[PDB]
Amino acid sequence: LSFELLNAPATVCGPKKSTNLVKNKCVNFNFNGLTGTGVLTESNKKFLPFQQFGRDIADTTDAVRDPQTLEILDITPCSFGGVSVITPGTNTSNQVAVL
Amino acid sequence: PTNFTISVTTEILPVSMTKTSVDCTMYICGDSTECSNLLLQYGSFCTQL
Numbered sequence: 001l002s003f004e005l006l007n008a009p010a011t012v013c014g015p016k017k018s019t020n021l022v023k024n025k026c027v028n029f030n031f032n033g034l035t036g037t038g039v040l041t042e043s044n045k046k047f048l049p050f051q052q053f054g055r056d057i058a059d060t061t062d063a064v065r066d067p068q069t070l071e072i073l074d075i076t077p078c079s080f081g082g083v084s085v086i087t088p089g090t091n092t093s094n095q096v097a098v099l
Numbered sequence: 100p101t102n103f104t105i106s107v108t109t110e111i112l113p114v115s116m117t118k119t120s121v122d123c124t125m126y127i128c129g130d131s132t133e134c135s136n137l138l139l140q141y142g143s144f145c146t147q148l
Protein backbone atom coordinates (compact mmCIF):
# COMPACT_ATOMS: atom_id res chain seq x y z
CA LEU A 1 0.00 0.00 0.00
CA SER A 2 1.37 3.40 -1.04
CA PHE A 3 -0.45 6.52 0.13
CA GLU A 4 0.16 10.28 0.03
CA LEU A 5 -0.93 13.27 2.11
CA LEU A 6 -1.16 16.69 0.44
CA ASN A 7 -3.36 19.77 0.09
CA ALA A 8 -6.47 18.16 -1.38
CA PRO A 9 -9.74 16.57 -0.22
CA ALA A 10 -9.39 13.31 1.67
CA THR A 11 -10.69 10.15 0.00
CA VAL A 12 -9.97 7.27 2.43
CA CYS A 13 -9.76 7.99 6.14
CA GLY A 14 -9.37 6.14 9.42
CA PRO A 15 -12.06 5.00 11.85
CA LYS A 16 -12.07 7.94 14.26
CA LYS A 17 -15.32 9.50 15.45
CA SER A 18 -15.84 13.23 14.95
CA THR A 19 -17.14 15.61 17.61
CA ASN A 20 -18.38 19.16 18.10
CA LEU A 21 -16.62 22.39 17.16
CA VAL A 22 -15.49 24.71 19.97
CA LYS A 23 -14.67 28.29 19.02
CA ASN A 24 -12.83 31.11 20.81
CA LYS A 25 -11.04 28.75 23.20
CA CYS A 26 -7.64 27.11 23.56
CA VAL A 27 -8.12 23.57 22.27
CA ASN A 28 -6.26 20.81 20.53
CA PHE A 29 -7.74 20.14 17.11
CA ASN A 30 -7.52 17.34 14.55
CA PHE A 31 -8.76 18.40 11.10
CA ASN A 32 -8.42 15.60 8.52
CA GLY A 33 -5.43 14.16 10.34
CA LEU A 34 -3.79 17.58 10.74
CA THR A 35 -3.20 18.14 14.45
CA GLY A 36 -2.54 21.39 16.26
CA THR A 37 -3.17 23.60 19.27
CA GLY A 38 -4.67 27.05 19.45
CA VAL A 39 -7.78 29.21 19.26
CA LEU A 40 -10.36 28.68 16.52
CA THR A 41 -12.26 31.74 15.27
CA GLU A 42 -14.15 32.58 12.11
CA SER A 43 -12.37 34.38 9.28
CA ASN A 44 -12.74 35.51 5.66
CA LYS A 45 -9.65 34.20 3.84
CA LYS A 46 -11.48 32.72 0.85
CA PHE A 47 -9.70 29.62 -0.43
CA LEU A 48 -9.49 27.83 -3.75
CA PRO A 49 -12.16 25.17 -4.42
CA PHE A 50 -9.80 22.30 -3.54
CA GLN A 51 -7.60 23.99 -0.94
CA GLN A 52 -7.82 22.51 2.56
CA PHE A 53 -5.45 24.65 4.63
CA GLY A 54 -3.26 27.70 4.20
CA ARG A 55 0.07 28.49 5.82
CA ASP A 56 1.92 31.77 6.36
CA ILE A 57 5.43 33.13 5.78
CA ALA A 58 6.82 31.26 8.81
CA ASP A 59 5.62 27.93 7.31
CA THR A 60 3.09 27.42 10.10
CA THR A 61 -0.57 26.64 9.50
CA ASP A 62 -2.67 29.81 9.52
CA ALA A 63 -6.15 28.84 8.31
CA VAL A 64 -8.03 25.57 7.91
CA ARG A 65 -11.29 24.42 6.31
CA ASP A 66 -13.91 22.54 8.29
CA PRO A 67 -14.54 19.21 6.53
CA GLN A 68 -18.20 18.67 7.41
CA THR A 69 -19.45 22.26 6.97
CA LEU A 70 -17.23 23.86 4.33
CA GLU A 71 -16.46 26.95 6.40
CA ILE A 72 -13.07 28.62 6.78
CA LEU A 73 -11.51 29.08 10.22
CA ASP A 74 -8.18 30.52 11.32
CA ILE A 75 -5.75 29.66 14.10
CA THR A 76 -4.05 32.07 16.49
CA PRO A 77 -1.60 31.25 19.28
CA CYS A 78 -2.76 30.66 22.83
CA SER A 79 0.18 32.62 24.26
CA PHE A 80 0.35 36.37 24.83
CA GLY A 81 4.02 37.31 24.82
CA GLY A 82 4.18 40.96 25.81
CA VAL A 83 3.57 40.92 29.57
CA SER A 84 6.00 42.51 32.05
CA VAL A 85 5.87 42.51 35.85
CA ILE A 86 6.86 45.61 37.82
CA THR A 87 7.96 44.58 41.29
CA PRO A 88 9.82 46.04 44.25
CA GLY A 89 12.07 43.64 46.13
CA THR A 90 10.25 40.39 47.04
CA ASN A 91 12.00 40.96 50.44
CA THR A 92 10.12 44.26 51.05
CA SER A 93 6.66 43.22 49.79
CA ASN A 94 4.72 40.79 47.61
CA GLN A 95 2.89 43.30 45.41
CA VAL A 96 3.28 43.63 41.64
CA ALA A 97 1.93 45.60 38.72
CA VAL A 98 1.40 44.23 35.22
CA LEU A 99 2.13 45.90 31.88
CA PRO B 100 44.39 87.16 4.21
CA THR B 101 42.46 90.40 3.94
CA ASN B 102 38.78 89.29 4.39
CA PHE B 103 37.03 86.26 5.91
CA THR B 104 34.02 83.98 5.66
CA ILE B 105 31.53 82.44 8.10
CA SER B 106 30.68 78.83 7.29
CA VAL B 107 28.02 76.58 8.86
CA THR B 108 28.54 72.82 8.55
CA THR B 109 26.60 69.70 9.55
CA GLU B 110 27.62 66.50 11.33
CA ILE B 111 25.35 63.49 11.96
CA LEU B 112 25.93 60.77 14.59
CA PRO B 113 24.03 57.65 15.69
CA VAL B 114 23.35 57.40 19.41
CA SER B 115 21.17 54.33 19.93
CA MET B 116 19.39 51.41 18.30
CA THR B 117 16.22 49.38 18.87
CA LYS B 118 15.62 47.24 21.96
CA THR B 119 14.26 43.73 21.44
CA SER B 120 13.27 40.68 23.47
CA VAL B 121 12.87 37.05 22.43
CA ASP B 122 10.69 34.31 23.92
CA CYS B 123 12.68 31.08 23.68
CA THR B 124 9.83 28.58 23.98
CA MET B 125 7.45 30.43 21.66
CA TYR B 126 10.10 30.69 18.94
CA ILE B 127 11.33 27.10 19.23
CA CYS B 128 8.29 25.02 20.19
CA GLY B 129 5.29 27.28 19.68
CA ASP B 130 2.53 26.25 22.14
CA SER B 131 3.33 22.55 21.82
CA THR B 132 3.41 20.24 24.82
CA GLU B 133 5.37 17.39 23.24
CA CYS B 134 7.95 20.04 22.48
CA SER B 135 8.81 22.37 25.38
CA ASN B 136 8.92 19.16 27.38
CA LEU B 137 11.75 17.86 25.20
CA LEU B 138 13.14 21.40 25.43
CA LEU B 139 13.65 20.95 29.15
CA GLN B 140 16.33 18.26 29.00
CA TYR B 141 18.42 20.71 27.01
CA GLY B 142 20.43 23.18 29.03
CA SER B 143 20.12 26.81 30.10
CA PHE B 144 20.38 28.30 26.62
CA CYS B 145 17.36 30.55 27.18
CA THR B 146 18.18 32.50 30.34
CA GLN B 147 21.67 33.25 29.02
CA LEU B 148 20.14 34.76 25.86
Ligand SMILES: *[C@@H]1O[C@H](CO)[C@@H](O[C@@H]2O[C@H](CO)[C@@H](O[C@@H]3O[C@H](CO)[C@@H](O)[C@H](O)[C@@H]3O)[C@H](O)[C@H]2NC(C)=O)[C@H](O)[C@H]1NC(C)=O
Pocket residue numbers: 101102103
Ligand atom coordinates in the same frame (compact mmCIF):
# COMPACT_ATOMS: atom_id res chain seq x y z
C1 LIG C 1 34.69 91.10 2.24
O1 LIG C 1 33.83 90.20 1.56
C2 LIG C 1 32.47 90.55 1.58
C3 LIG C 1 31.74 89.40 0.92
O2 LIG C 1 31.89 88.28 1.79
C4 LIG C 1 32.27 91.87 0.88
O3 LIG C 1 30.92 92.25 1.14
C5 LIG C 1 30.26 92.60 -0.08
O4 LIG C 1 30.43 93.95 -0.47
C6 LIG C 1 30.03 94.11 -1.82
C7 LIG C 1 30.41 95.53 -2.21
O5 LIG C 1 29.98 96.40 -1.15
C8 LIG C 1 28.54 93.83 -1.92
O6 LIG C 1 28.13 94.03 -3.28
C9 LIG C 1 26.89 94.76 -3.30
O7 LIG C 1 25.81 93.95 -3.75
C10 LIG C 1 24.54 94.61 -3.71
C11 LIG C 1 23.46 93.65 -4.18
O8 LIG C 1 23.48 92.48 -3.36
C12 LIG C 1 24.59 95.85 -4.58
O9 LIG C 1 23.34 96.54 -4.49
C13 LIG C 1 25.71 96.77 -4.12
O10 LIG C 1 25.79 97.90 -5.00
C14 LIG C 1 27.02 96.01 -4.16
O11 LIG C 1 27.34 95.63 -5.51
C15 LIG C 1 28.33 92.38 -1.51
O12 LIG C 1 26.96 91.98 -1.57
C16 LIG C 1 28.79 92.24 -0.08
N1 LIG C 1 28.54 90.90 0.40
C17 LIG C 1 27.97 90.72 1.59
C18 LIG C 1 27.66 89.31 1.99
O13 LIG C 1 27.71 91.66 2.30
C19 LIG C 1 33.14 92.88 1.58
O14 LIG C 1 33.07 94.15 0.94
C20 LIG C 1 34.59 92.45 1.56
N2 LIG C 1 35.33 93.44 2.28
C21 LIG C 1 36.55 93.79 1.92
C22 LIG C 1 37.36 94.49 2.97
O15 LIG C 1 36.97 93.55 0.81
Ligand SMILES: *[C@@H]1O[C@H](CO[C@@H]2O[C@@H](C)[C@@H](O)[C@@H](O)[C@@H]2O)[C@@H](O[C@@H]2O[C@H](CO)[C@@H](O)[C@H](O)[C@H]2NC(C)=O)[C@H](O)[C@H]1NC(C)=O
Pocket residue numbers: 067068069
Ligand atom coordinates in the same frame (compact mmCIF):
# COMPACT_ATOMS: atom_id res chain seq x y z
C1 LIG D 1 -21.83 15.78 6.87
O1 LIG D 1 -22.77 15.37 7.85
C2 LIG D 1 -23.36 16.39 8.61
C3 LIG D 1 -24.27 15.65 9.56
O2 LIG D 1 -24.91 14.67 8.75
C4 LIG D 1 -26.26 14.48 9.19
O3 LIG D 1 -26.37 13.30 9.98
C5 LIG D 1 -25.97 12.12 9.28
C6 LIG D 1 -26.03 10.93 10.23
C7 LIG D 1 -26.85 11.89 8.07
O4 LIG D 1 -28.21 11.70 8.48
C8 LIG D 1 -26.76 13.11 7.17
O5 LIG D 1 -27.65 12.97 6.06
C9 LIG D 1 -27.16 14.34 7.96
O6 LIG D 1 -27.06 15.48 7.11
C10 LIG D 1 -24.10 17.35 7.70
O7 LIG D 1 -24.55 18.47 8.46
C11 LIG D 1 -25.98 18.65 8.38
O8 LIG D 1 -26.35 19.48 7.28
C12 LIG D 1 -27.76 19.57 7.14
C13 LIG D 1 -28.11 20.35 5.88
O9 LIG D 1 -27.89 19.48 4.76
C14 LIG D 1 -28.36 20.22 8.36
O10 LIG D 1 -29.78 20.30 8.19
C15 LIG D 1 -28.02 19.36 9.56
O11 LIG D 1 -28.55 19.95 10.75
C16 LIG D 1 -26.51 19.27 9.67
N1 LIG D 1 -26.21 18.44 10.81
C17 LIG D 1 -25.25 18.75 11.67
C18 LIG D 1 -25.13 17.85 12.85
O12 LIG D 1 -24.51 19.70 11.49
C19 LIG D 1 -23.14 17.85 6.65
O13 LIG D 1 -23.88 18.60 5.69
C20 LIG D 1 -22.50 16.71 5.89
N2 LIG D 1 -21.48 17.30 5.07
C21 LIG D 1 -21.56 17.45 3.76
C22 LIG D 1 -20.85 16.43 2.93
O14 LIG D 1 -22.15 18.39 3.26
Ligand SMILES: *[C@@H]1O[C@H](CO)[C@@H](O)[C@H](O)[C@H]1NC(C)=O
Pocket residue numbers: 089091092
Ligand atom coordinates in the same frame (compact mmCIF):
# COMPACT_ATOMS: atom_id res chain seq x y z
C1 LIG E 1 14.77 42.24 54.13
O1 LIG E 1 13.90 42.84 55.08
C2 LIG E 1 14.44 42.73 56.40
C3 LIG E 1 13.39 43.15 57.42
O2 LIG E 1 12.98 44.47 57.08
C4 LIG E 1 15.70 43.57 56.51
O3 LIG E 1 16.16 43.36 57.85
C5 LIG E 1 16.72 43.08 55.48
O4 LIG E 1 17.87 43.93 55.43
C6 LIG E 1 16.10 42.99 54.08
N1 LIG E 1 17.03 42.35 53.18
C7 LIG E 1 17.16 42.69 51.89
C8 LIG E 1 18.05 41.82 51.05
O5 LIG E 1 16.59 43.66 51.41
